Amino acid sequence: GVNAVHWFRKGLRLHDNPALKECIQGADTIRCVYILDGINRWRFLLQCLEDLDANLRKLNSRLFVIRGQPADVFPRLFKEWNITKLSIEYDSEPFGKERDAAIKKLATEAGVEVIVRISHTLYDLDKIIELNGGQPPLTYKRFQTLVSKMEPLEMPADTITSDVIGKCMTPLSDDHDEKYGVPSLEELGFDTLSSAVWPGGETEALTRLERHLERKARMNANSLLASPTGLSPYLRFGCLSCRLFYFKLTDLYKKVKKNSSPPLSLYGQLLWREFFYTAATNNPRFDKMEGNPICVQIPWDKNPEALAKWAEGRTGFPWIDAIMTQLRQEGWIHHLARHAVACFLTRGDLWISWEEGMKVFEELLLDADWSINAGSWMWLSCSSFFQQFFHCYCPVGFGRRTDPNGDYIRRYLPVLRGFPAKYIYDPWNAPEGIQKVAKCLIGVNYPKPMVNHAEASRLNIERMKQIYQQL
Numbered sequence: 001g002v003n004a005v006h007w008f009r010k011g012l013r014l015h016d017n018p019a020l021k022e023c024i025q026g027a028d029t030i031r032c033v034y035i036l037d038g039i040n041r042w043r044f045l046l047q048c049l050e051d052l053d054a055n056l057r058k059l060n061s062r063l064f065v066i067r068g069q070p071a072d073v074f075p076r077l078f079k080e081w082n083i084t085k086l087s088i089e090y091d092s093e094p095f096g097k098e099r100d101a102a103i104k105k106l107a108t109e110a111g112v113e114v115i116v117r118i119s120h121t122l123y124d125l126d127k128i129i130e131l132n133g134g135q136p137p138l139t140y141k142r143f144q145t146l147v148s149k150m151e152p153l154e155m156p157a158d159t160i161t162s163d164v165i166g167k168c169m170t171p172l173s174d175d176h177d178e179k180y181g182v183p184s185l186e187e188l189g190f191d192t193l194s195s196a197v198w199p200g201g202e203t204e205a206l207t208r209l210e211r212h213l214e215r216k217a218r219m220n221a222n223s224l225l226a227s228p229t230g231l232s233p234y235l236r237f238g239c240l241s242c243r244l245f246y247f248k249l250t251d252l253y254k255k256v257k258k259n260s261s262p263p264l265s266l267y268g269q270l271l272w273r274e275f276f277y278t279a280a281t282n283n284p285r286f287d288k289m290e291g292n293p294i295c296v297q298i299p300w301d302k303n304p305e306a307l308a309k310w311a312e313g314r315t316g317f318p319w320i321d322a323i324m325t326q327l328r329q330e331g332w333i334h335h336l337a338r339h340a341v342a343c344f345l346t347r348g349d350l351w352i353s354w355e356e357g358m359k360v361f362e363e364l365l366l367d368a369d370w371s372i373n374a375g376s377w378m379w380l381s382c383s384s385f386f387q388q389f390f391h392c393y394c395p396v397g398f399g400r401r402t403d404p405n406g407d408y409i410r411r412y413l414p415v416l417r418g419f420p421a422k423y424i425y426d427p428w429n430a431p432e433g434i435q436k437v438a439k440c441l442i443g444v445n446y447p448k449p450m451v452n453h454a455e456a457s458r459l460n461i462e463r464m465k466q467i468y469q470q471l
Contacts, residue, residue: 002027004085004168005077007070008034008063009096010120011089012048013202014055016156016241019117023087024160027168031081032056033064035073036183038363039190040198040331047200048237049182055202059162061170064180071102078110087115089238092125092281093370122153122242122270125278136279138294139386143275144264156244197226197330198233198366205234209245213252221403224326224334232367233332235273242270276375279385287374289355294384298467300346300353307352309450310345311360313413316442316449318425319399320344322412329412331366336402340393342380347464348392349456354381382464389464392457400425415446 004027006020014020024030034049053063066073077083086107091100100116107114118124128146129136137143158164173179185192212229234240246267253262264271279294280286289295308314313321313328323337333341344350345357354377361368361377368376378384399409406424410417416427418438423430428442428449435441442448 001082002085003029003081003083004031004087005081005083006030006032006087008032008052009089009091010236010238012052012238013205013241014052014160015202015206016119016244017089017160018119018157019087019089019115020160021157021164022115022117023085024165024168027085029081029171030061030165030168031064031170032061033066033077035070036065036067037069038331039185039193040196040364041366042188042190043185043193043196044198044200044233044237044331044366046182046185047196048202048239051201051203051239053182059160059165061165062172062176062180063182064176065182066180067183070099071106074103075106075110078107078112083110083112085113085115087117089120090116090118092121092277094281094284094286095370097281118154119157119241119243120238121277122246122274123147123150125274125281128278129282136282137275138279138384140272140275143278144271147271147274148264153243153246156241156247198230198332200233200237200239202234202239205231205240208234209240209248213248216249217252217256219336219402221405221408224337224403224408226330226332230332232269235270236367236369236372242273246270273372277371279375280371287355287358287370289353289383295378296383296467298353298381298383298464301351303350303352306350306450307345307356309447310341310350310352310357314447314450315344315395316428316447317344317395317453318406318409318413318416318427319402320395322399322409325412327361327364331364333365336398338376339380340395340398342377343393344395346377346381346383347389347460349395349451349453349460351456351460351463354378354383357381390461392461394457395453396425413446415440 004023006023011017011019020032049063049065056063088100091097104114127150131146131149137146208229208231212231215229231240231245235242249266250262253266254260283292283294285292289297310320310324313324315321320341323333323341327333342354342357345352346354358373358377361373365373379387382389404421406421409424416424416438418440419427419430419434423434427440427446430438430442440446
């Protein structure tokens with residue numbers, strides 16, 4: 001008698017799920033569980049779980065959602081259900097490893113075989129680190145070189161279908177909706193908001209992938225807005241398999257461009273994601289400055305007033321404030337906009353730790369998990385990965401060059417809708433008569449800029465230089 005449990009954490013999908021596929025094989029019963037320990041991230045999650053539950057329902061099964069801590073939950077589940085097999089998608093993240101090692105111990109005690117399969121990343125990250133001699137690579141270029149030395153990527157596992165399940169079944173009681181149902185936002189305590197710009201789930205992910213490949217078959221102002229074929233949140237939650245994406249990308253290139261040796265540039269989004277997971281996996285202090293062996297020690301200031309102005313879009317720099325408003329409202333911003341607000345907060349203008357901007361993004365950004373968010377923030381503040389710090393993004397000019405008309409500003413900061421393009425990125429320079437026509441007095445209706453960028457950035461660039469030896 002083989003009673004199996006698959007434990008969803010990431011990998012919130014039925015396609016390319018090797019762990020769930022292996023767990024079902026030879027099983028007499030299967031139950032899939034999700035254990036629930038910023039409003040936009042919670043909504044996306046719950047929408048992923050609703051979609052998972054729906055698709056399981058098509059297979060005469062159901063998702064089992066449980067509120068609690070895994071170490072306090074699984075031993076009683078093992079006992080009641082007489083479990084002999086538990087499957088998980090491998091989690092490279094350091095605190096995920098530690099959680100999963102505790103569960104593996106509990107599982108062995110209960111006589112439960114633990115199935116673990118890699119499918120959140122393109123590669124076995126431990127193999128990359130071994131090829132590099134026991135440390136992760138500290139430059140992106142070195143990482144790409146190592147990747148080119150890996151064996152060819154694993155093909156996606158077969159999708160879980162009725163045929164796959166076979167005679168394996170799921171016991172269900174009439175009170176499943178009450179006992180094991182996906183909670184609502186209200187039920188978590190949220191005051192609920194218009195429909196999400198980024199709807200969660202595998203079903204959404206797969207249609208987006210197709211249209212993304214069709215479109216793929218150049219920056220501009222429109223790139224700042226959420227794309228209906230954007231894929232990054234679905235990759236972070238596991239709604240979309242990165243290996244399916246990679247394989248589809250390769251196949252399309254070969255058909256369209258008649259070549260079977262594509263560039264590494266083709267997978268740039270996927271590989272930068274892989275780079276940060278590799279860097280993070282053996283470093284439990286990856287998300288800190290102090291005690292983090294790869295992070296340059298930089299004397300950031302503590303400044304809660306300034307941090308709050310940045311976090312809340314009240315800096316008085318419209319380009320910065322609009323980005324942080326779009327982020328709070330919708331949960332995604334363009335990678336160039338991340339550069340802008342990360343440099344402003346850290347090395348550029350406010351000289352505040354990347355750890356504090358990381359905390360804000362963790363609450364708000366749909367595609368930022370522990371490894372990606374920490375790695376990204378160290379990258380953008382020039383704290384690791386040998387990033388260049390001699391240039392500082394201009395919190396007026398970069399936006400003016402990205403959206404010269406200023407529509408993005410007017411869109412996310414309606415209080416500034418009345419300014420002409422001439423002043424939309426620097427409204428403090430607008431004559432009083434313009435401010436009156438705009439019905440926005442700078443310093444009253446919209447804050448004046450919190451710093452003198454030319455002066456602050458000049459000093460911060462010199463200060464960063466003087467950290468290192470002069471030659």
